[PDB]
């Protein structure tokens, strides 16, 4: 019970744009009350798998979300499916869906939701991939905690890129962050 | 220490001294995973020198140091630019009722990094990132982080702040990074 | 058993070039289902020690790695010496070799070894130090997992830059990554 994660397979559990288009691989892990967080993205289909801005100037960024409740399981409009978002055992998942996760959920002191208080950027994680495992195929990976509306807590990832890519696959290489668990 | 939290708290009450009293917020979270000390870090200006910047009219304003200085039982001394009013170990929200008196397992390792003498200084007792101000990903600035560096003290970590682009107007208010470094004990 | 390391001494324990001609420090410390990792080098003699690429255009590169067998154990053919890699025992090493540490291993799923398989870029991670901890000094570090032969396990760091030094000692400040576990 020390770690959510997605599994470490290349089966696809997420949509972008299309039904099952991805697969995200995100691992938390809980150190106390910070979290470990490992990260990486394949696309294998649709508008976001291989990025030609010759040919379409305008596909430069899309955005990933999980939506939590109270007890920190996911919101099946998330962005992740929930059929394989679990704790760990070897290299799956416990048989049954996880009921509380609230210490695995960024804290609402440090990451709080919109209001018209100043919003701080404190709440925002800031990393570069590269597509291809390639050094001169950078894209921006901007995590942002407790933003979204319709849920308790919220973790989003963000990518995008400034270059003018031709025919470039989008999979990533893997970043690590961490954040302030709640409890 | 085994698996506990030390830290700032995660409000917004500024707790630090840069150029004038209470200046800003810094907010930094060290968590001890055995050999290694987690640390996540950013900061807030609310006022004074640092608060908002501007190159153009101040254009060799481009660097700040926030110091933290520690004795022999890993105790914060009164004379860092953070406040020990609110630095102890975590308990819910905020902290423990006790002002801590052991912190040893949450210091930066002295081989590893040791004080300043005149045999060579080594690189590895560096960390940089970069942090993001107000959130936009064009208004990057450098934090350098560095162990066991200051004098009057035992151990320390001090985060030296700096900047390259020349801002106009500019919060000084940051994204959040991570790190890690090697503990004592 | 939490902590794989080298030692934070500064006598040299790798062979890049030649014999012993630096001294790489690793620290591997598990938090169950990730490791994490921090690492730095000082390159004390031989052709990498100062770089001069106005006299050695060509020379903007090298690779460490550490190959391990189906327990965890470090093998021979890594440039890092078997007589200095052990767990943590104080500020020292325990005085015996140790015989498994397959816990701290780069899980083969993430991270599979090469084959005719589509291969994916998240066995990868990118970061960038710093020489001689001046800002203006960058190096590339490349760390990927599990891509080289005669193992079962491998870690490997690629150290590379794009700039034109002229008489700079190859000595870095520290990044750290984290990566998924095999067991
Ligand atoms: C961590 C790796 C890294 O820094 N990559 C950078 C890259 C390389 O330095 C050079 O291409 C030499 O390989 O240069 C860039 O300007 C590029 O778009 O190509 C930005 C990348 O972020
Ligand atoms: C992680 C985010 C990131 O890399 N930001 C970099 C930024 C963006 O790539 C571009 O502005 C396109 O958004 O480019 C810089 O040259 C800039 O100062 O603008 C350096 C920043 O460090
Ligand atoms: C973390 C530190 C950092 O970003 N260093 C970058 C450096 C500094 O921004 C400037 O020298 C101003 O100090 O600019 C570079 O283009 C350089 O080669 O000099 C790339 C470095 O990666
Ligand atoms: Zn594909
Ligand atoms: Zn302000
Ligand atoms: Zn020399």
Chains 1, 3 share one sequence.
């Not at 942002?144 to 003018?164: A, H, L, P, R, V």
Request: glycine share 6%; aromatic share 12%.
């Amino acid at each position: 019970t020390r770690t959510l994660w997605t599994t470490p397979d290349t089966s696809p559990n997420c949509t972008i744009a299309q039904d099952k288009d991805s697969k995200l691989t995100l691992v938390l892990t809980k150190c106390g009350s910070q979290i470990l967080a490992n990260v990486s993205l394949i696309v294998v289909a649709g508008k976001y798998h291989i990025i030609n801005n010759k040919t379409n100037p305008k596909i430069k960024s899309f955005t990933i979300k999980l939506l939590f409740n109270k007890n920190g399981v996911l919101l099946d409009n998330s962005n992740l499916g929930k059929a394989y978002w679990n704790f760990r055992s070897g290299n799956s998942n416990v048989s049954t869906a996880y009921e509380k996760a609230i210490g695995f959920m960024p804290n609402l002191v440090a990451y709080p939701k919109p209001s018209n208080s100043k919003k701080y950027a404190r709440d925002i994680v800031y990393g570069t991939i590269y597509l291809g495992g390639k050094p001169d195929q950078p894209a921006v990976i901007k995590t942002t905690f407790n933003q979204e509306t319709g849920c308790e807590y919220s973790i989003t990832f963000n990518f995008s890129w400034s270059k003018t890519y031709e025919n470039v696959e989008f999979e990533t290489t893997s970043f690590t962050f961490s954040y302030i668990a709640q409890e």
